[PDB]
Design a protein around this ligand. Structure first.
Ligand SMILES: NC(=O)C1=CN([C@@H]2O[C@H](COP(=O)(O)OP(=O)(O)OC[C@H]3O[C@@H](n4cnc5c(N)ncnc54)[C@H](OP(=O)(O)O)[C@@H]3O)[C@@H](O)[C@H]2O)C=CC1
Ligand SMILES: NC(=O)C1=CN([C@@H]2O[C@H](COP(=O)(O)OP(=O)(O)OC[C@H]3O[C@@H](n4cnc5c(N)ncnc54)[C@H](OP(=O)(O)O)[C@@H]3O)[C@@H](O)[C@H]2O)C=CC1
Ligand SMILES: [Cl-]
Ligand SMILES: [Cl-]
Ligand SMILES: [Zn+2]
Ligand SMILES: [Zn+2]
Lengths: 349, 349
């Protein structure tokens, strides 16, 4: 009865949370709904990094509407904070509002958030934990990775022909993804950073922007170990996003608004460096050498395919080598298709 | 009302028809159900090439049960024949049984079957045409192709890594397909012939048998233009199936139960030759040169993928060449996945 209703309400809370994806990072996305006598009476989401917490938005909304919250229920994706930020903690707000039941998707893995569940139970409140927990952990996987592993979540996205080519015999890559391009721009609108190698910049001179007009551009991370992009203004160096170039070249020079990060350039150093720049997620977009280096480090792989067939061309993972005896390292968790294209989502075993 | 019931009954007729797939070829698979006062009272399917027609099986079954067929309805996938074979035509049987309504999925494209629909309507019977017609044409696509295009239906099936490799750097292909192997054996149990090149025979020495114990082995078609398989007993030459080797070598010699077909070896000549040997369907299974040659001739392509990644290896279509400017020639009509594997069905645009 209630548990099915709690799942229905948690579904809406997740939908609410998603409104902040790409803006809250590296905070988690959070959604909150306040229910009274079975009706949602207010809603809230975390809108941007350092903005109001979802619970506060929802509770203040309710009060503005003249709702009496005494005896109401809060359904919230993440355990409410129990630390004084700029404001008192959400725990105190919830307690003082008269809310009697708090339903949580997952506990906050960040130690500094404190013991919200315990505080609530110490003030007579019913705390129900784990409603749609798996869905909520997926929702917050960037944050969970950032907090628990101290690195960004890594996705690897490629566009390939049926025969595993990311470019034809001339090195041309245009026009492989078409009807599934919207998925890429969705990803660019959510991932904090997108990452490409210098061979891609030299060959394709890509924008790497989110093409949704009202979206936001992700941070561009350019891997240029040897400094071959020095002294030129490629489209990835346009001043429409934060831009970081990792290189081992002291000589290399990039435009003044681009951060040059002189580095040993190991995947490990790159990921630590990004963590230290508050980047909770990176979308590795190529090319072949980059794919090859990051493949063992990906938390998710998105293979965008086309029914095109090139015959000869640049292989997706041309720098990798394995053989038939090595078992697969990924499982398929989802496939989508449209017209001449399909998208496979894979996750590490 | 009735039309929904006709679709329900036609669904069962299709399910019945499928019991003959792989055995009826090059006849079509056909299913029949007899319904009286809303109940299925008898069923029938075409069991093997030159066997009883589905309608006859169903009508004789009903009579054996003591059912009075006067005023009953027949639902049958394919338009009943109006030619005297060994037996009188199904049209006469149906008329004489007292059946008043005949519901057909699709008309028979074979001219020799005659004008069943018209005969029925001339003997007062209600003929309803086109129920689940698209599904039935899919069911009979081998036969429809055979009759209307005078060639076998061609499917191309490959097993590839994510990066488009059908073999690793050592030429090893073992263990790519695992959890989807059952789909391959299903196909081998239904397609009249399976086809491979000599490079595959030399490298893999495959059985190319249907591994379902109670299935049946398809005809093996081996493409050996140069006669490199001469004088050796590969597993494809075991006497557990009909075997045809196409070659331009007069010198080549194969075991006595193998048919040597001396040919110019064009895809066109091969397909005509197979048509002339009453083969209504061929499953092209590799390798790379063969895939490359047949790709433009495939009616359907089945890409079996694994999340394995080889890095370097033998490309699926290593003999083909295209580029980014060529539009895709296939649409995705279905995707299935399990564990570390996925299957994409593609059809020509
Ligand atoms: N269809 C698709 O999904 C896409 C296709 N493409 C195609 O791929 C091709 C480009 O691929 P490719 O040529 O392999 O080039 P990459 O884009 O993989 O760039 C390789 C360059 O990046 C540097 N690099 C690689 N890893 C690092 C790192 N860890 N830190 C710093 N620098 C690093 C390399 O340094 P070093 O020389 O020392 O190794 C090299 O200079 C183009 O043809 C493009 O059209 C590109 C992206 C996606
Ligand atoms: N993972 C998978 O789906 C599979 C992988 N494999 C792998 O593929 C490899 C074999 O591929 P590949 O080497 O390209 O060899 P193929 O199996 O494609 O065989 C090529 C041979 O067949 C002959 N041939 C090709 N077309 C015709 C034709 N129209 N008529 C008569 N003869 C023809 C060729 O003649 P000519 O020399 O004159 O061109 C050549 O001798 C092996 O490594 C095997 O392990 C094989 C099958 C499937
Ligand atoms: Cl771009
Ligand atoms: Cl086999
Ligand atoms: Zn809070
Ligand atoms: Zn008949």
């Amino acid at each position: 009865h209630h548990h099915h209703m709690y799942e229905t309400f948690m579904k809406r809370a997740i939908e609410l949370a998603k409104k902040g994806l790409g803006r809250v990072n590296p905070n988690p996305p959070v959604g909150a709904v306040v229910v009274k006598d079975g009706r949602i009476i207010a809603e809230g989401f975390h809108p941007y990094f350092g903005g109001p917490h979802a619970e506060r938005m929802a509770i203040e909304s309710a009060r503005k509407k003249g709702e009496d919250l005494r005896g109401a229920t809060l359904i919230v994706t993440l355990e409410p904070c129990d630390h004084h930020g700029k404001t008192p903690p959400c725990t105190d707000l919830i307690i003082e509002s008269g809310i009697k039941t708090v339903v949580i998707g997952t506990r906050d893995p960040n130690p500094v958030s404190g013991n919200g569940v315990e505080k609530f139970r110490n003030h007579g409140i019913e705390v129900i934990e784990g409603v749609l927990e798996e869905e909520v952990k997926k929702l917050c996987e960037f944050f969970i990775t950032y907090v628990t592993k101290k690195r960004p979540f890594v996705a690897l996205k490629y566009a390939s022909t049926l025969d595993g080519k990311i470019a034809d015999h001339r090195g041309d890559s245009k026009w492989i993804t078409d009807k599934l391009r919207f998925k890429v721009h969705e990803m660019r609108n959510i991932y904090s950073a997108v990452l490409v190698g210098a061979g891609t910049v030299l060959k394709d001179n890509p924008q790497l922007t989110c093409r949704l007009k009202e979206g936001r551009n992700p941070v561009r991370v350019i891997l240029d170990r040897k400094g071959v992009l020095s002294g030129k203004v490629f489209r990835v160096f346009e001043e429409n996003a934060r831009v970081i170039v990792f290189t081992e070249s002291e000589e290399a020079e990039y435009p003044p608004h681009v951060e040059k990060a002189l580095s040993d350039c190991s995947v490990e150093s790159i990921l630590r460096n990004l963590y230290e720049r508050d980047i909770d997620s990176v979308l590795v977009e190529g090319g072949s050498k980059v794919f090859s280096e990051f493949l063992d480090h990906a938390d998710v792989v998105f293979g965008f395919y086309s029914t095109k067939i090139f015959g000869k061309g640049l292989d997706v993972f041309s720098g990798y080598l394995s053989d038939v005896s090595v078992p697969p390292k990924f499982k398929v968790v989802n496939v989508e298709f449209s017209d001449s294209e399909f998208l496979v989502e894979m996750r590490p075993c």
